[PDB]
Amino acid sequence: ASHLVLYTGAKMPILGLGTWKSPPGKVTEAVKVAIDLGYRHIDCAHVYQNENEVGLGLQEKLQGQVVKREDLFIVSKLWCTDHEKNLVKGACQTTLRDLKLDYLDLYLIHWPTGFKPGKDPFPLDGDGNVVPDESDFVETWEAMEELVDEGLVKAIGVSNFNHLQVEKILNKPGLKYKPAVNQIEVHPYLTQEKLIEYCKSKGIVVTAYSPLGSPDRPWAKPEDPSLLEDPRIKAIAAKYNKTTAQVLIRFPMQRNLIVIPKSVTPERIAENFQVFDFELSPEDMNTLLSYNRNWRVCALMSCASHKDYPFHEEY
Numbered sequence: 001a002s003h004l005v006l007y008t009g010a011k012m013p014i015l016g017l018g019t020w021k022s023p024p025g026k027v028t029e030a031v032k033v034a035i036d037l038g039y040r041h042i043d044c045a046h047v048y049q050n051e052n053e054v055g056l057g058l059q060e061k062l063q064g065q066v067v068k069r070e071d072l073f074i075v076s077k078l079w080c081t082d083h084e085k086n087l088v089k090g091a092c093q094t095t096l097r098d099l100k101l102d103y104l105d106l107y108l109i110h111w112p113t114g115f116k117p118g119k120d121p122f123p124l125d126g127d128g129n130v131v132p133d134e135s136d137f138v139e140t141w142e143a144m145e146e147l148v149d150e151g152l153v154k155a156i157g158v159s160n161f162n163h164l165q166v167e168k169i170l171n172k173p174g175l176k177y178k179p180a181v182n183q184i185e186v187h188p189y190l191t192q193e194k195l196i197e198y199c200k201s202k203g204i205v206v207t208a209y210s211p212l213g214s215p216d217r218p219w220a221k222p223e224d225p226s227l228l229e230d231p232r233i234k235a236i237a238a239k240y241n242k243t244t245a246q247v248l249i250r251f252p253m254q255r256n257l258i259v260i261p262k263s264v265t266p267e268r269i270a271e272n273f274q275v276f277d278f279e280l281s282p283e284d285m286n287t288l289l290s291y292n293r294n295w296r297v298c299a300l301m302s303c304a305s306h307k308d309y310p311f312h313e314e315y
């Protein structure tokens, strides 16, 4: 409904601006452009190293009265080095301070993997593996619930959790709040209909990250399948006189999934909002779904031996 509704009642805007890889000197302008274009949901994260600058763009629009705080859906994410129970409130408070916000609308446990605490976001050992920590995300979750109780965040969720990790939370003795969201990688080459179905049976909204398959991911070694340059999606795009991009964004929306496409380019931010004006005919929907190569762009391979690494499971 141009939004999905979380089990709390909160209306979560269906399209949002993604800010990973959005450089600090560009993201304040991208956020500003986006809110002027009507975007009311911004997806952020401590680890993106730009929440201050996202904060500046929001601030300007808020004091410039272009939007009200109640009309904004700001998401941020607890990073892996901050999973120890006692580190969770501090990590949320830094994020609130950098975003210059009194509360978040959604705070997600970014990855199920907790890493050794410290300033390095990926503590690596001599073998190049990331160093784990003494925590289970069930304890992290208990601290995340405290943020709801104190009013720092309006809802809590998870990101990159496999269905068995969500289950461990749902079956937690003394559970106060469920994940309201599971933000996971979704796009034609990783359609995820089984995890989506599981989250939906549990009443957990799904946000699809990397709808365009992350062309700019640092590790895009040239012989990587490009969804935007994929002749097939370009053809179905042609049928609508829309771009590959607009089609790839319409797809998760049509599957009742929140999309958060990233762009620091003003023109492409406008383009990406110009998707609510058509519907993909069900055949085309089925075409796109069939491309499921189970191809993951964000596999976090460096953490593959972590006890809580999410991707060895089917879904």
Ligand SMILES: NC(=O)c1ccc[n+]([C@@H]2O[C@H](COP(=O)([O-])OP(=O)(O)OC[C@H]3O[C@@H](n4cnc5c(N)ncnc54)[C@H](OP(=O)(O)O)[C@@H]3O)[C@@H](O)[C@H]2O)c1
Pocket (backbone or CB within 6 Å): 017, 018, 019, 020, 021, 043, 044, 110, 159, 160, 183, 184, 208, 209, 210, 211, 212, 213, 214, 215, 216, 228, 245, 246, 260, 261, 262, 263, 264, 265, 268, 269, 271, 272, 298
């Ligand atoms: N929770 C997680 O662990 C996680 C993981 C990955 C991503 N995410 C979230 O999902 C967001 C989106 O994913 P992503 O940034 O990884 O990748 P993405 O949105 O799939 O791809 C962004 C790339 O596509 C380009 N692009 C955007 N709009 C375009 C358009 N209309 N036409 C042509 N090219 C276009 C961007 O270029 P320009 O920006 O230069 O225009 C950029 O190179 C992230 O920013 C982040 O907020 C979350």
Ligand SMILES: O=C1NC(=O)[C@@]2(CCOc3ccc(F)cc32)N1
Pocket (backbone or CB within 6 Å): 020, 045, 047, 048, 110, 298, 299, 300
């Ligand atoms: O937007 C993103 N959030 C993330 O956790 C991820 C996916 C996995 O890999 C990395 C690596 C570095 C980073 F800053 C971020 C990421 N991308």
